[PDB]
Symmetry: D2
Subunit: 237 residues, 4 copies
């Protein structure tokens, strides 16, 4: 199986797998059963922004999600990712629907990783920023139902031509290049990601959510990972 | 009195004010008596690099110092700087000598502060990077004995024309513009600084050290802050 | 008198000072009579974005202005700014109204200047980015009628509480720190600026425009520089 | 055949293919016979730095090369790269030796490409920075004789364990991800690259040089491109 570290924006409460009884943001370390969660007052049909941060000195994976005119939600978990993830990874976004559904539209996505060594010329960095997505976005690996280019956006899950989200959908987008997240000479290592999203559902109960994730380089959508599994995990263990 | 948050590279052990019995790096919150320290294997005459990091989600002020071919030293302290510092600050470097002495030469200095709001256009930022210093560096406020331009460097404390550091010296350099470190709409705030330095002494016992500091905007060198007080504090309380 | 280099977004045609008979963008080198102009299909009440670019290798000052869903306008002028501007400058935004009027609202403003030397550690940089403006924006020098904080924006010229722009207004905002634009060791020097703006008028004929400008450090609004002079020049010479 | 745009640091004068009678820097558009050249006072065994710049408004490909304590060399050529290169490219470094030889050592390499659209959220960017190279640098495609990790450097051409450069060698390194260099909505597009290099030869006549290049995504070393062809071209046409 793949190795997954993720921040979930979980829109549907599956209480038998540890979700609280409301939409929430969570830190997922190798399991869909979040290590830490916080209540998320998700707004159907509104554009929100998520920020994810981590550094090797503090060893705390943190996330903040907000909408204009609203308070933020935040969640943090103390974890040494050097002990979870391999030295080289890919980074991505994932989303799913199940018997309940929503659009999982990404309007923008940025990422920066840095490794500062003890040499006088210390800094290695990777940065990418998408504020629009082309019909042929060659620097993204699209998996499952994910598509790019419709209204300049990344649609992680299936949407019909009239905007209607489809159930039982899963899709991911990964940046094309492998990312160096640990190095033997690095004295400070850090990563951050930001994405803006539009989750809209014609229903009172949207599902299932969007995640930012970091994985082994050859990661692929696990079998049967629609719905509550967010395209990230093969089961709910 | 001024309000000071600082990371000290303390080259001389003053044990009656809480210094350990060796050169060390420390986190100073409104006092020269560091809240946290770590042993620092300072290398007389070698160019080193210091990194300082903080963000408002984790509320941990951390620093790493290293030399090429050597292990790093690191120190961290949990502190909500929103409860210490004002909303607007200046940032700077400070150094001192006393009856023992050293050069306090800065070869480069960079700083980045960011405030990300809950608006869709979220980011405010300030960044500066000096890899050399002019004889007339108009975007730096020089205090005390600090000078710029000699060999393209910033000399925080007095050095003679032949390279000899002078005792009983104190000097600081602050970036000209005020820096916005907290804002009511910010959902993520962060700062980082890096500087490279050359501390050299003709003596077996160098003193007193270099600090990166954040202060009220009108901060000035306190009276009698040579030596163990690092140009930062009026006393050892 | 001050020394001014500016890119003008000129909303009102003053044909006796060389304006074409339509709104236009122009490169102004020490005179309001632009050295080069291009037609600008200004859209009353819509948010637009302007980009300004220059580097010391190509010695060409260029600007691009656009609105969503519209083609851009662009203008360029070959000029060695080393022969116009001093070594240290301030950078700013300026706007005016006269007997005709408009809002001159700035929603965001960013700037980056770089000096790369022939040393192995080559880069000096200054960068600032405002995507919102506080009621007390301490890193901006506000001149004339300019204010910050209303709806998080920078209003360069006077607007009443109900949104009504006032005539005979002039105002500027300059970044607090001096900016190093030329240095003897620099092998590549460059600057860029971007700003987003909302020019709205209740009238069919808005006036007078907005400019991004670079000036001597002590620059101030010239006397009688309302209207066609854009807050930049004391006369139309 | 591949499509190549390159900046050459040409260490050996091949006068029958248009080289001047000295080491030189050149702009190569689809041919090793540079469209523009400038004299380059190459220093055997010294670390130098090259900068390459281009933007879609000015349509001028420019390069600057320097060593510490020395004047720079610069070359520029007016060319609309939209008419040369495809929309998506890869970027890389190339070097060669022939019957004359040199080390072609890369100590650092950075690249930034930006596409700014007419949307209010305008910016797309890719940036990478290597100040060291790992024995397994997964985000680089190494071609021919190129290797990474020896002393933390990228060796484009073959070097023995004792530092001796080998003749008849060719090697390239390309960034793993495709790069978007033109887009239909982009109102400003730009790229820049910097690399630091050490060319050393035990001989009075080093050869053949190093190039920064942009190519079709599937570019590969052409047959027989050792020596004067710099790993870039299949012939001298
Ligand atoms: Ca769930
Ligand atoms: Ca001490
Ligand atoms: Ca006019
Ligand atoms: Ca040649
Ligand atoms: Cl939210
Ligand atoms: Cl529900
Ligand atoms: Cl150290
Ligand atoms: Cl001692
Ligand atoms: Cl426009
Ligand atoms: Cl008119
Ligand atoms: Cl050179
Ligand atoms: Cl020769
Ligand atoms: Mn959950
Ligand atoms: Mn101490
Ligand atoms: Mn005009
Ligand atoms: Mn040549
Ligand atoms: Na939403
Ligand atoms: Na030292
Ligand atoms: Na407008
Ligand atoms: Na060389």
């Amino acid at each position: 199986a793949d190795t997954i570290v993720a921040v979930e924006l979980d829109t549907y409460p599956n209480t038998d797998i540890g979700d609280p009884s409301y939409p929430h943001i969570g830190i997922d370390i190798k399991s869909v059963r979040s290590k830490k969660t916080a209540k998320w007052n998700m707004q159907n049909g509104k554009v929100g922004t998520a920020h994810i941060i981590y550094n090797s000195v503090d060893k705390r994976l943190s996330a903040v999600v907000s909408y204009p005119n609203a308070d933020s939600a935040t969640v943090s978990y103390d974890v040494d990712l050097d002990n979870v993830l391999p030295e080289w990874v890919r980074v991505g976004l994932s989303a799913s629907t199940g018997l309940y559904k929503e659009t999982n539209t990404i309007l923008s996505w940025s990422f920066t990783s840095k490794l500062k060594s003890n040499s006088t010329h210390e800094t290695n960095a990777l940065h990418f920023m998408f504020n629009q997505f082309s019909k042929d976005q060659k620097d993204l690996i699209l998996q499952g139902d994910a598509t790019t280019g419709t209204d300049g956006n990344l649609e992680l899950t299936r949407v019909s031509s009239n905007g209607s989200p489809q159930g039982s959908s899963v899709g991911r987008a990964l940046f094309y290049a492998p990312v160096h997240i640990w190095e033997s000479s690095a004295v400070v290592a850090s990563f951050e990601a930001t994405f803006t999203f539009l989750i809209k559902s014609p229903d009172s109960h949207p599902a299932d959510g969007i995640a930012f994730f970091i994985s082994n380089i050859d990661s692929s959508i696990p079998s049967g990972s629609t719905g509550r599994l967010l395209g990230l995990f093969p089961d709910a263990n």
